[PDB]
Structure 1
């Protein structure tokens, strides 16, 4: 399982390099890469790719032998073999690639993490936490599975409490604004 998942990630990376499509590894996988240790196995592989390259992404999935299950407003889900590819579109703005609705520096150009001895670009701790907190608003922490809870803890600790607090406050502010907009409209 774990080896298979790592191998798939390696393959997806290799395809992305061949396509000349930048890949930022996200979520728990990013956290593990940034830690340097694949601590936990994850059925879903969360990878961030520039949105404009959707056609290339479809080709990549086909090259992998998988099929794209569905395309959603926040990205596309693809089944590759027995593993799930969750693709988050990175939006190229101000000469920078940014995760949708996420703070600047979401997807650093630098080789942030390492997987299986291969250096990999990973989304920032801030981006990771932004996603998790966003998920928290959707689903209560009590409902959260151990893996997600642990991943959130690791990311928060690594980034630093104060920074995490700032992120939480920022996101709450964003959500409140969104609610107000909706209520007005």
Structure 2
């Protein structure tokens, strides 16, 4: 969506004004790290400081949107027709961390680009990590192409050995 790209800019601009860091996650995070739009994305994934949820909600409402229901891992919001999938991160020692995610999931540096603009986005490890859950719940043979090819891009970018080490950590933690 041209709509999603512009909505991302609008959200980040509003967050910047509030000195509120926000990380782009999921599909858009992959494209941000690649610096190229590769794929339609169902929604916009956001990671936010859990202790400043109120400020994110205010941004959403400022933009004519609304906060919808709680999710198992965060909350859902909406601007126009577009859905915002929002997950909190919490201050660790010198960075924010998503609960039950790899260390370094919310890097301070803006390490991606969307439509020429630098953006904060979740790490490759954090991105990959969520595919592990997905694989436990949905047989990868039933994954749509949009998710399959994005997963493979992430694996290509991170490297096969690092992915398998991360998978081992995932399996071990949840066994």
TM tier relative to shorter chain = over 0.9
Output the CA distance in 2 between the equivalents of 1:90 and 1:11.
21
TM-score (norm 2): 0.96
Counting matched residue pairs gives 174
Ranges in structure 2 where 5+ consecutive residues have no aligned partner: none
Output the CA distance in 2 between the equivalents of 1:139 and 1:15.
36
Matches for 1:67-78 after TM superposition, within 5 Å: 67-78=66-77
CA-based RMSD:
1.0
C-alpha offsets along residues 16-52 of structure 1, whole Å, 9 cap, x if unaligned?
1112110111111000011110111212111111111
Ranges in structure 1 where 5+ consecutive residues have no aligned partner: 176-185
Report how far residue 135 of structure 1 moved: 1.8
Report how far residue 151 of structure 1 moved: 0.9
TM-score (norm 1): 0.91
What is aligned with 1:121? Answer: 120
1:151 partner SS: helix
What is aligned with 1:157? Answer: 156
Output the CA distance in 2 between the equivalents of 1:53 and 1:18.
14
More moved, 112-121 vs 138-147? 138-147
Output the CA distance in 2 between the equivalents of 1:22 and 1:16.
7
Report how far residue 95 of structure 1 moved: 2.8
Report how far residue 72 of structure 1 moved: 2.6
Structure 1 runs (4+) greater than 3 angstroms displaced: none
Output the CA distance in 2 between the equivalents of 1:77 and 1:172.
28
